[PDB]
Design a protein around this ligand. Sequence first.
Ligand SMILES: NC(=O)c1ccc[n+]([C@@H]2O[C@H](COP(=O)([O-])OP(=O)(O)OC[C@H]3O[C@@H](n4cnc5c(N)ncnc54)[C@H](OP(=O)(O)O)[C@@H]3O)[C@@H](O)[C@H]2O)c1
Ligand SMILES: Nc1nc(=O)c2nc(CNc3ccc(C(=O)N[C@@H](CCC(=O)O)C(=O)O)cc3)cnc2[nH]1
Length: 160
Amino acid sequence: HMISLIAALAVDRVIGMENAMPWNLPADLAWFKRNTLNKPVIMGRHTWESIGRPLPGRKNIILSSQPGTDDRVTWVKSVDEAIAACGDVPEIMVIGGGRVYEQFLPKAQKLYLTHIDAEVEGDTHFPDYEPDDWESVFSEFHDADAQNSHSYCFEILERR
Ligand SMILES: NC(=O)c1ccc[n+]([C@@H]2O[C@H](COP(=O)([O-])OP(=O)(O)OC[C@H]3O[C@@H](n4cnc5c(N)ncnc54)[C@H](OP(=O)(O)O)[C@@H]3O)[C@@H](O)[C@H]2O)c1
Ligand SMILES: Nc1nc(=O)c2nc(CNc3ccc(C(=O)N[C@@H](CCC(=O)O)C(=O)O)cc3)cnc2[nH]1
């Protein structure tokens, strides 16, 4: 009934390098937690492998073209199967990675983005979300501090 993408972006909207995350910002991941819990989460098979354990309290739906390899989650073969597998919920969280984010952006009505002031070379990037289609409805800047080496910004965008 409603799809959101939730993603932490560095410069160039880098989200993934060597299939990891080199921007140790704990308030950046504590932001993922306030926004994803009790909502179903959709992710691609690579993002599933990097969490290594379902997100608790939540239907975990993992897109892959091949049979599943973990009974603790729900395996689906298409974007529409992934959505249906989430049930009748007010909001579905799409949590990556690159390929899954791109497929779900046209279906999304909300984006929850952390922008981190960090240079990381990056093979994988968040999809280009046109400003004409998205409106910033929340935005809070934070300088680097004791826990965060990087300056960062939590943002919430709603589809126009
Ligand atoms: N910073 C962030 O916000 C964020 C979010 C998550 C992860 N990441 C990074 O993003 C990268 C991962 O993204 P990725 O693109 O590498 O892999 P992914 O998007 O996590 O999932 C890729 C895999 O999902 C499956 N898949 C996706 N769409 C499908 C579809 N429509 N039908 C069937 N199967 C489908 C395929 O698995 P098969 O090959 O089995 O078909 C595909 O190989 C990593 O670098 C990760 O660290 C960052
Ligand atoms: N805002 C935001 N920040 C992120 O770091 C992020 N990461 C992903 C995909 N990658 C990951 C990697 C690790 C964990 C993770 O370990 N989180 C656990 C514990 C809570 C925490 O560590 O913050 C979880 O319960 O989801 C989640 C997503 C998707 N959306 C995001 N969104």
